Design a protein around this motif. Structure first.
Motif, mmCIF file in Angstrom:
data_model
loop_
_atom_site.group_PDB
_atom_site.id
_atom_site.type_symbol
_atom_site.label_atom_id
_atom_site.label_comp_id
_atom_site.label_asym_id
_atom_site.label_seq_id
_atom_site.Cartn_x
_atom_site.Cartn_y
_atom_site.Cartn_z
ATOM 1 N N UNK A 61 12.205 10.236 0.827
ATOM 2 C CA UNK A 61 12.001 11.442 0.042
ATOM 3 C C UNK A 61 10.679 12.099 0.380
ATOM 4 N N UNK A 62 9.618 11.306 0.486
ATOM 5 C CA UNK A 62 8.319 11.901 0.771
ATOM 6 C C UNK A 62 8.250 12.466 2.184
ATOM 7 N N UNK A 111 10.469 17.314 -6.189
ATOM 8 C CA UNK A 111 11.159 16.917 -4.968
ATOM 9 C C UNK A 111 10.656 17.593 -3.703
ATOM 10 N N UNK A 112 9.953 18.717 -3.821
ATOM 11 C CA UNK A 112 9.515 19.460 -2.640
ATOM 12 C C UNK A 112 8.066 19.114 -2.318
ATOM 13 N N UNK A 113 7.642 17.962 -2.811
ATOM 14 C CA UNK A 113 6.251 17.569 -2.686
ATOM 15 C C UNK A 113 6.166 16.196 -2.049
ATOM 16 N N UNK A 114 5.195 16.005 -1.171
ATOM 17 C CA UNK A 114 4.691 14.660 -0.983
ATOM 18 C C UNK A 114 4.017 14.236 -2.280
ATOM 19 N N UNK A 115 3.762 12.946 -2.424
ATOM 20 C CA UNK A 115 3.220 12.399 -3.668
ATOM 21 C C UNK A 115 4.234 12.490 -4.802
ATOM 22 N N UNK A 116 5.482 12.755 -4.452
ATOM 23 C CA UNK A 116 6.577 12.712 -5.406
ATOM 24 C C UNK A 116 6.694 11.285 -5.924
ATOM 25 N N UNK A 176 10.081 15.773 2.203
ATOM 26 C CA UNK A 176 9.261 16.841 1.650
ATOM 27 C C UNK A 176 8.185 17.295 2.619
ATOM 28 N N UNK A 222 12.208 5.837 -1.571
ATOM 29 C CA UNK A 222 11.067 6.689 -1.903
ATOM 30 C C UNK A 222 10.356 7.248 -0.668
ATOM 31 N N UNK A 223 10.120 6.413 0.345
ATOM 32 C CA UNK A 223 9.436 6.900 1.540
ATOM 33 C C UNK A 223 10.203 8.024 2.212
ATOM 34 N N UNK A 226 7.241 3.699 6.116
ATOM 35 C CA UNK A 226 6.190 3.468 5.141
ATOM 36 C C UNK A 226 4.851 3.988 5.641
ATOM 37 N N UNK A 227 4.592 3.867 6.941
ATOM 38 C CA UNK A 227 3.351 4.392 7.492
ATOM 39 C C UNK A 227 3.434 5.895 7.685
ATOM 40 N N UNK A 234 2.450 7.488 4.418
ATOM 41 C CA UNK A 234 1.046 7.363 4.053
ATOM 42 C C UNK A 234 0.172 8.274 4.902
ATOM 43 N N UNK A 236 0.838 -1.195 0.000
ATOM 44 C CA UNK A 236 0.000 0.000 0.000
ATOM 45 C C UNK A 236 0.879 1.252 0.000
ATOM 46 N N UNK A 237 1.282 1.684 -1.182
ATOM 47 C CA UNK A 237 2.025 2.920 -1.362
ATOM 48 C C UNK A 237 1.362 3.702 -2.480
ATOM 49 N N UNK A 274 1.245 11.194 6.120
ATOM 50 C CA UNK A 274 1.513 12.529 5.607
ATOM 51 C C UNK A 274 0.786 12.791 4.301
ATOM 52 N N UNK A 275 0.498 11.753 3.532
ATOM 53 C CA UNK A 275 -0.245 11.943 2.299
ATOM 54 C C UNK A 275 -1.740 12.051 2.555
#
Lengths: 37, 145, 215, 58, 175
Positions: free
Chosen positions: D4-5, B40-45, D8, D1-2, D34-35, D38, B3-4, D40-41
RNA sequence: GGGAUAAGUGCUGAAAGCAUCUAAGCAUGAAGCCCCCCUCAAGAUGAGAUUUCCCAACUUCGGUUAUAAGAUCCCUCAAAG
RNA sequence: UUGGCACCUCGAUGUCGGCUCAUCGCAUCCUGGGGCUGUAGUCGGUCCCAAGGGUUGGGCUGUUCGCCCAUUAAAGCGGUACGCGAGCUGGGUUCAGAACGUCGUGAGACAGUUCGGUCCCUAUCCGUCGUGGGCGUAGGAAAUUUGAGAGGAGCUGUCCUU
RNA sequence: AUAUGUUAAGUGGAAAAGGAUGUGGCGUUGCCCAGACAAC
């Protein structure tokens, strides 16, 4: 002008200076003028 | 449990910014702008889609160097003809065509992929204090440094 | 002096006073008219556009370039004129003269004027070898087997490739050529010809484009 | 990836990833990377409350 | 900086106005200005000016003696003025005026015409002595050097343009 | 012919009460560098500009037709191949 | 350059000199700019900047190299598989014939001379020189164009006046 | 990123004998306002 890696005073009136990042000497007689290179 | 979140083209919202290259150091402005052209300055990157914003650099003839860089920062451009190597100093390249100076400095900090090429096409450098894109309603950004 | 278009008739000679022989080219320049005029506010640069010789009017089912088509008709009618075969622009002239629709006559030039002529050189087919590049033959004798080929093309290993300017067979042909600093020998207003000293590029009955000399 | 998010998301509260993770550890929180991304999104308020606790533990 | 600390700067009928960055000087021949410096500040007691340097950095104490000397030269030039005189030596070498411009005859197959510039005044004494008067010391020196570089002195007979008091090393080369 | 430079020559000028082409400033100076001269060049995917010409209905606009300005097939050729 | 080493190639990386065609370095032969001179003038010597262009025909040898004859502003030194044989030649040398000197009892040998002695290949890919078809460039066409970039050119003598 | 300093050479990001008023740190010892240290 003498261009040699070894620049020294030959006179007693010769003088050592730096111009644009290079070592030189200057006397009144133009034979003694040198610069490092 | 996989779940990503991954961004689609039906998710992304790109907005417009205006940077002022007045009294800033090349390179130090360029890396901060390059991080914005990518998301890069965003979540959902997400790395396989383009999720960054558009930038506009305005003054760009007031950019600065620190050392003696303006007289010996040659650029060198070969042309694939025998003995065809050409050259220009950084000082004379911001005197004529200051827009190619900054554009080339920023594009050298982007990946050389099919996506890096498309992301670098959102840059819009100008020399002087005005730009044509008032219809996109851009905000000011105020570099972090 | 400034600019005109014409066709190349041929070559002859003329005796100059003091009785010296002068080889000369006959250029016929009739029906020059100023079409559109370009300005820096509308186009970004100043120039005038001239049309050389008139073709026939628009016909419903024409099938060659002898009759004008609708867009050329309209363009040549915006200035009250007939359609033309050749059209060129002149940037060296002063644009504040030359009202649109004027006729550029052959006596704008005077005897003694230094000019530059620009034509398209004439048409040599696949000729490549020692004719294209002025290269040397190999020996015709002792054991040769090497007569009109090109030499070596490059080196070994170091350059595992040829190079971008290498001279090889591939059609002489018809480039654009300018000959500088010729001279006007005589202007003939009733026949509408100019006598140019020397020879100019191209075949007979081709377009020539005379301009005042830049040097 | 996590990472990086999360980085940000933390710059929007004037923190870097480095200090946020340090503070969360000193607070004892044991949420995955990983959590943490999610949250933060999907839920910005919960992530804000995490950030305040990470800030108070420093 | 001894010369920098020894900032007297005694004015004259010349008035000395400050504009922060640059300075303008008015006088009998004034209205010439120059941009001085940023980090150094001035103070005028009654009329006289004195310079003060901050932070005692070597850059500061080097700019000190310079900013002190430029103001002195620029205010003393409007008061009195500057002059440089140079003499011609050689057979047939002569120069005379063409109004404001100057032409010279120094052995070339053509005379040399050096037209004048602002704030400068040429004047020939006896077709062999030339002086330059002006208010800018640097500009006077520049032109005095430029007219000299037309025919500098040669060491065998001394012929050529010469500064009025210049010593010239002479060689003795016999056939 | 113009602009900026090399080796070099300088002006003013302190640090270092003198001196000094240099550290702030200001000039000059090569058939070499950039232009000026000739040719190509918007596939310059950043695909530019100007002048003139042309403009339809059906329709389930799914597409079907028929077309406009303008081209081409075919044929007589050469200043082109 | 002559060597030292023996790491790629012995189910083949196949040749000295010349010819044809080049391309690069600068430690510069000529032409341009300077300093010093034990540089009077005309000539020179030495050093510094400078790679834009230029840099010859013969006699003798297979010759590279070298000597010589006439010129020239000058007749630079090097790298490119000692550049270039799927572009050419084949004079030389490691092929079978023959002879001389010399060595060997001999069959033979020298690296010493001398005369003679077969040079294969229809270009698939990259590269390079020319020349077309397709689509793209937010309607479709005809003509005239700006120039981001790229290529070309870039040499020098003698005489007359001052 | 927090403190302190060094470098002006793009040194960092290829080398020696030698040469040199480039600039920091650390000591010992001379001449010091009765007047040097230069200019006149």
């Amino acid at each position: 002008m003498k261009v040699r890696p070894s620049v020294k005073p030959i006179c007693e009136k010769c003088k050592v200076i730096k111009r644009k990042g290079k070592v030189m000497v200057i006397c009144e007689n133009p034979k003694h003028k040198q610069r490092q290179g | 449990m996989r779940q990503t979140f991954m961004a689609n083209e039906s998710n992304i919202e790109r907005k417009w910014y205006v940077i002022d290259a007045e009294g800033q150091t090349l390179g130090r402005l360029s890396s901060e702008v390059a991080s914005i052209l990518r998301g890069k300055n965003k979540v959902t990157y997400t790395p396989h889609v383009d999720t960054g914003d558009y930038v506009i650099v305005i003054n760009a003839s007031k950019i600065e160097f620190t050392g003696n860089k303006e007289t010996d920062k040659v650029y060198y451009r070969h042309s694939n003809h025998p003995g065809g190597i050409k050259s220009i100093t950084a000082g004379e390249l911001r005197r004529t065509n200051p827009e190619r100076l900054i554009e080339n400095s920023i594009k050298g900090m982007l990946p050389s992929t099919r996506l890096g090429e498309k992301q670098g096409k959102k840059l819009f450098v100008y020399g002087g204090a005005e730009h044509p894109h008032a219809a996109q309603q851009p905000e000011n950004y105020e570099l972090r440094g | 002096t400034k600019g005109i278009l014409g066709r190349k008739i041929g070559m002859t000679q003329v005796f100059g006073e003091n009785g010296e022989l002068i080889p000369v080219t006959v250029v016929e320049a009739k029906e020059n008219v100023v079409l559109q005029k370009k300005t820096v506010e509308v186009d970004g640069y100043n120039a005038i556009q001239v049309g050389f010789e008139d073709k026939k009017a628009y016909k419903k089912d024409a099938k060659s370039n002898k009759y004008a088509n609708k867009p050329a008709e309209g363009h040549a009618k915006k200035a009250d004129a007939a359609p033309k075969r050749f059209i060129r622009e002149f940037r060296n002239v002063d644009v504040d003269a030359y009202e649109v629709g004027q006729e550029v006559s052959v006596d704008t030039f005077v005897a003694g004027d230094v000019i530059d002529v620009t034509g398209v050189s004439k048409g040599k087919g696949f000729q490549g070898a020692i004719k294209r590049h002025g290269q040397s033959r190999g020996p015709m004798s002792h054991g040769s087997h090497f007569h009109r080929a090109p030499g070596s093309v490059g080196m070994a290993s170091d350059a595992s490739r040829v190079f971008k300017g290498q001279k090889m067979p591939g059609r002489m042909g018809g480039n654009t050529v300018t000959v500088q600093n010729l001279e006007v020998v005589q202007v003939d207003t009733e026949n509408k010809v100019i006598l140019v000293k020397g020879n100019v590029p191209g075949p007979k009955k081709g377009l020539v484009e005379i301009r005042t000399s830049i040097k | 990836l996590w990472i990086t998010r999360i980085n940000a998301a933390a710059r929007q509260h004037e923190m870097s990833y480095s200090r946020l993770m340090n503070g969360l550890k000193k607070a004892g929180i044991d949420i995955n990377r990983k959590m943490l991304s999610e949250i933060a999104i999907s839920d910005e308020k919960a992530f804000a409350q995490l950030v305040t606790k990470a800030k108070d533990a420093l | 900086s001894r010369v920098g600390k020894k900032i007297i700067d005694i004015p004259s009928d010349v008035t000395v106005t400050f504009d922060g960055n640059h300075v303008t000087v008015k006088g009998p021949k004034g209205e010439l200005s120059r941009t001085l410096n940023e980090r150094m500040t001035f103070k005028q007691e009654e009329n006289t000016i004195e310079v003060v340097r901050p932070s005692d950095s070597k850059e500061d104490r080097t700019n000190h003696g310079t900013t002190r000397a430029l103001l002195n030269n620029m205010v003393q030039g409007v008061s009195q003025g500057y002059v440089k005189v140079l003499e011609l030596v050689g057979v047939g070498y002569r120069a005379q005026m063409q109004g404001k411009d100057l032409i010279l005859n120094v052995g070339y197959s053509h005379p040399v015409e050096i037209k004048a510039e602002e704030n400068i005044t040429f004047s020939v004494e006896k077709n062999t002595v030339v002086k330059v008067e002006g208010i800018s010391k640097e500009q006077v020196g520049a032109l005095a050097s430029n007219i000299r570089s037309v025919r500098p002195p040669e060491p065998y007979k001394g012929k050529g343009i010469r500064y009025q008091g210049e010593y010239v090393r002479r060689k003795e080369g016999k056939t």
